[PDB]
Design a protein around this ligand. Structure first.
Ligand SMILES: *[C@@H]1O[C@H](CO)[C@@H](O)[C@H](O)[C@H]1NC(C)=O
Ligand SMILES: *[C@@H]1O[C@H](CO)[C@@H](O)[C@H](O)[C@H]1NC(C)=O
Ligand SMILES: *[C@@H]1O[C@H](CO)[C@@H](O)[C@H](O)[C@H]1NC(C)=O
Ligand SMILES: *[C@@H]1O[C@H](CO)[C@@H](O)[C@H](O)[C@H]1NC(C)=O
Ligand SMILES: *[C@@H]1O[C@H](CO)[C@@H](O)[C@H](O)[C@H]1NC(C)=O
Ligand SMILES: *[C@@H]1O[C@H](CO)[C@@H](O)[C@H](O)[C@H]1NC(C)=O
Ligand SMILES: *[C@@H]1O[C@H](CO)[C@@H](O)[C@H](O)[C@H]1NC(C)=O
Ligand SMILES: *[C@@H]1O[C@H](CO)[C@@H](O)[C@H](O)[C@H]1NC(C)=O
Ligand SMILES: *[C@@H]1O[C@H](CO)[C@@H](O)[C@H](O)[C@H]1NC(C)=O
Ligand SMILES: [Ca+2]
Ligand SMILES: [Ca+2]
Lengths: 343, 210, 222
């Protein structure tokens, strides 16, 4: 019949062959056009195991987005290894578009339709499709932006939630808008305070289903490169680094409500020219920002968290923002898919 | 919160026998448990991981079985070189350890007493040392007497690791006194009680007497 | 082969700071969690924290939060443990270690050689070495015991040999004890034929590298 397999996938997109924006440009040669009327077939009485943490689709997407970035966002200087590389570094238009991943002949994608499927285990409602949904390849840490939302309940996905070395992917039901704007390197981002606190209350409540009736604490990153200790992302081709202390700095007892004790949280940000690459070990330097107002607005649709360990602590659990491996970003979207080969 | 509780405190099995060590988890942890061997002064050594997988290079006499809350390490054909403390682990949490020793026939200690040297005394302190050599089992009572007064709280003991060839222990007890107190008394005695001795053995000397 | 080489022993006063290094080789440094574990005398292993070298993400055991930091240098593939506001019960062997597999970060197959960090108000001091002289009542044609008392040194460790390594059988060198004074002491003893006491020289060789003290002590019947 069929069985789990790894194969070379292809991508599909609605890219504009005329557009100068770099995702469009890449997708014009890397991908085919989307199918106007894609077919999805329910597999009656079929049960299948998935593992979002060992899904090779993720790796294929990762290598593609690496290629997109490499040929799109050229640094003035690269220090990959000990050798320094000088080159042209123009400002570009850079705004993600959805990319779909599809199986070639002889292979198929199975799709789990179970509500709040955690990404690992038996799916009861399976369908087959030729392509995934359209995934914007948004590169960020701490907050997942412009991603998919859970239908009904906040959903937690972790390879082992009690293993403090494992990332915890959180998917929200309601998005929280984050509005950013740009010493020409000084910038800042706003989130609605009431909305963000209601979210944390609900995230806390969900975490208690795994960790028990305990106090849930959100705290800032314990360390690492700036890309992961801040919410880093890009807007208008520029690399933003935003301090999220104002977002992760609260203690939620079992009886706590957002109502306890402007309605705006302002996050201080900086636009950096010197950055650590996510694709690759090494440093890249870009040109300063062009004069004028730089603005972008995104929806927070998920979080990347870690949890503190400890051999002794009852009473509370502490969670901190994390990320850095963009494969986890792709996983947050690809968790419900797996590739199979046909007889 | 996870607690890993090991038992027994000590396993004593004759050479060639099987040692069975247990580790209980306070909540279900699937197969996510490992075991280590630790000898004093050496780096801990991975034996078993994922409850049952033998680590590279580990002798086949080591095996593991476990799931959920119960975990066991078994050592068949027990060898003197397996004498060590064994720890179970669940991610960052470690159990308290279980000691494994070889069980052998009872062997009485040979006992020796050593007076303080002249050089030490000239500096204001007297150390008196009592040696128990090559005995089994490890449990022994060593009592210092000074002019027949039992001394307590002024001595420290040290014990060697079980010997790989004869499976015995040796033990030292060191009594520390000021020079002034040492010179106030005549008879210094170490009294040893042990399973291999039908009655306690006392070794003694008189201060200032060859 | 996967290999970790750590920096040398450290001795510190309470309130001081220490940095221990861990040089990695034989594998892809950025693809594995690197764990830091300590073990204090008579205690089980204790997790300090971990670092993921690709971007330096970390996790610190709660009891060390506020005085522990873990970093790395990707060019030399060396990890560092920075541990401050030290207390006496921080006295332990400190290790870096790595798991069996990338997705088994806790099952520690590969360990550095360890770094002793001693924390005490005591100051470095070499031992006094005193004789444990063979008894004048040693059984004729039987077995005698003699030894060396290696007293009042700091920090660990001390090594002891007999006759420059030529005498090894019958030797018991005991684990050190820590005295209420804050100094260590141990004894080394050996049993030999009583008939040898008049003809064989017996010398204990004591090395205390922390104070650069070496002692050769001849022990004979008083
Ligand atoms: C599977 O599909 C059926 C029919 O739509 C639905 O009633 C059921 O809730 C689904 N099961 C899961 C696990 O979501
Ligand atoms: C994830 O969902 C599966 C069913 O699809 C379930 O068997 C498993 O227990 C879930 N994992 C956790 C940690 O809840
Ligand atoms: C953020 O909020 C502050 C205070 O209301 C305001 O001054 C600023 O213009 C806001 N910025 C954005 C991006 O909305
Ligand atoms: C976390 O918060 C502390 C103050 O509570 C601050 O010193 C530290 O810089 C913060 N970390 C980050 C990444 O902002
Ligand atoms: C982030 O904000 C916190 C709180 O104001 C501050 O202590 C910390 O220094 C900031 N981080 C950076 C890198 O500026
Ligand atoms: C973190 O919370 C404390 C109150 O517990 C508050 O005083 C402080 O302003 C908060 N930090 C930031 C950077 O928002
Ligand atoms: C999120 O989507 C909006 C369009 O709705 C876009 O303008 C913005 O740049 C996106 N954010 C990121 C970080 O890609
Ligand atoms: C975020 O998405 C929600 C719908 O899920 C929408 O109401 C909101 O306008 C979006 N915000 C932006 C700026 O895209
Ligand atoms: C880790 O997850 C697996 C299922 O993927 C589960 O069987 C195991 O019990 C988990 N580990 C712990 C310690 O809970
Ligand atoms: Ca910069
Ligand atoms: Ca034997």
């Amino acid at each position: 019949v069929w069985r789990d397999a790894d194969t070379t996938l292809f991508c599909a997109s609605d890219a504009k062959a005329y557009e100068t924006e770099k995702h469009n440009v890449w997708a014009t040669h890397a991908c085919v056009p989307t199918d106007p009327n894609p077919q999805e077939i329910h597999l009656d009485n079929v049960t299948e195991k998935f593992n979002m943490w060992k899904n090779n689709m993720v790796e294929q997407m990762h290598t593609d987005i690496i290629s997109l970035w490499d040929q799109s966002l050229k640094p003035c200087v690269k220090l990959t290894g000990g050798s320094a590389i000088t080159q042209a570094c123009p400002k570009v238009s850079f705004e993600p578009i959805p990319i779909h991943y599809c199986t070639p002949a002889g292979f198929a994608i199975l799709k789990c339709k179970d509500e709040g499927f955690n990404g690992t285990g038996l799916c009861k409602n399976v369908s087959t499709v030729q392509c995934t949904h359209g995934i914007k390849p948004v590169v960020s840490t701490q907050l997942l932006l412009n991603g998919s939302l859970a239908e009904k309940n906040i959903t937690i996905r972790s390879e082992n939630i009690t293993n403090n070395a494992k990332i915890i992917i959180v998917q929200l039901v309601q998005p929280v808008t984050i509005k950013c704007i740009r010493d020409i390197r000084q910038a800042h981002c706003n989130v609605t305070r009431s909305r963000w606190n209601k979210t944390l209350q609900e995230v806390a409540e969900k975490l208690r289903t795994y960790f028990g009736n305990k106090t849930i604490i959100f705290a800032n990153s314990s360390g690492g490169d700036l890309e992961i200790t801040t919410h880093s992302f890009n807007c208008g081709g520029e690399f933003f680094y935003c301090n999220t202390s104002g977002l992760f700095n609260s203690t939620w007892y079992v009886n706590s409500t957002w109502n306890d004790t402007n309605d705006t949280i302002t996050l201080p940000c900086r636009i950096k020219q010197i950055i650590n690459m996510w694709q690759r070990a090494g440093q890249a330097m870009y040109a300063p920002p062009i004069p004028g107002v730089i603005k972008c607005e995104s929806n927070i649709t998920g979080l990347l968290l870690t949890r503190d360990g400890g051999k002794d602590n009852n009473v509370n659990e502490t969670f901190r923002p994390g990320g850095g491996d963009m494969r986890d970003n792709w996983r947050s979207e690809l968790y419900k898919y797996k590739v199979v080969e046909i007889e | 919160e996870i607690v890993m509780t090991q038992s027994p405190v000590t396993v004593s099995v004759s050479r060639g026998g099987t040692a069975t060590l247990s580790c209980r988890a306070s909540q279900g942890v699937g197969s996510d448990v490992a075991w280590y061997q630790h000898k004093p002064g050496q780096t801990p050594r991975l034996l078993i991981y994922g409850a049952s997988t033998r680590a590279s290079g580990v002798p086949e006499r080591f095996s593991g079985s476990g799931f959920h809350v119960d975990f066991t390490l078994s050592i068949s054909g027990l060898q003197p070189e397996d004498v060590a403390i064994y720890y179970c682990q669940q991610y960052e949490t470690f159990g308290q350890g279980t000691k494994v020793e070889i069980k052998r026939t009872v062997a009485a200690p040979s006992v020796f007493i050593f007076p303080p040297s002249d050089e030490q005394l000239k500096s204001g302190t007297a150390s008196v040392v009592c040696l128990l050599n090559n005995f089994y089992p490890r449990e022994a009572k060593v009592q210092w007497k000074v002019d027949n007064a039992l001394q307590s709280g002024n001595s420290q003991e040290s014990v060697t690791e079980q010997d790989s060839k004869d499976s015995t222990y040796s033990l030292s007890s060191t009594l520390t006194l000021s020079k002034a107190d040492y010179e106030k008394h005549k008879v210094y005695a170490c009294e040893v009680t042990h399973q291999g001795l039908s009655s306690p053995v006392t070794k003694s000397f008189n201060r200032g007497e060859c | 082969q996967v290999q970790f080489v750590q920096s040398g022993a450290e001795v510190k006063k309470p309130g001081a700071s220490v940095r221990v290094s861990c040089e990695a080789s034989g594998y892809s440094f950025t693809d594995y969690v690197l764990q830091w574990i300590r073990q204090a005398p008579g205690q089980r292993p204790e997790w300090m924290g971990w670092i993921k070298p690709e971007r330096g993400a970390v996790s610190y055991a709660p009891q060390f939060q506020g005085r522990l930091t873990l970093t790395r240098d990707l060019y030399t593939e060396t990890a560092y443990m920075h541990f401050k506001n030290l207390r006496s019960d921080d006295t332990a062997i400190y290790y870096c270690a790595r798991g069996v597999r990338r997705d088994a970060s806790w099952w520690l197959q590969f360990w550095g050689q360890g770094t002793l960090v001693t924390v005490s108000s005591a100051s470095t001091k070499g031992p006094s070495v005193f004789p444990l002289a063979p008894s004048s009542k040693s059984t004729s044609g039987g077995t005698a015991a003699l030894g060396c008392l290696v007293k009042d040194y700091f920090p660990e460790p001390v090594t002891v040999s007999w006759n420059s390594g030529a005498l090894t059988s019958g030797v018991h060198t005991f684990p050190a004890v820590l005295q209420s004074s804050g100094l260590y002491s141990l004894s080394s003893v050996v049993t030999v034929p009583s008939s040898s006491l008049g003809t064989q020289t017996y010398i204990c060789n004591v090395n205390h590298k922390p104070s650069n003290t070496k002692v050769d002590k001849k022990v004979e019947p008083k």
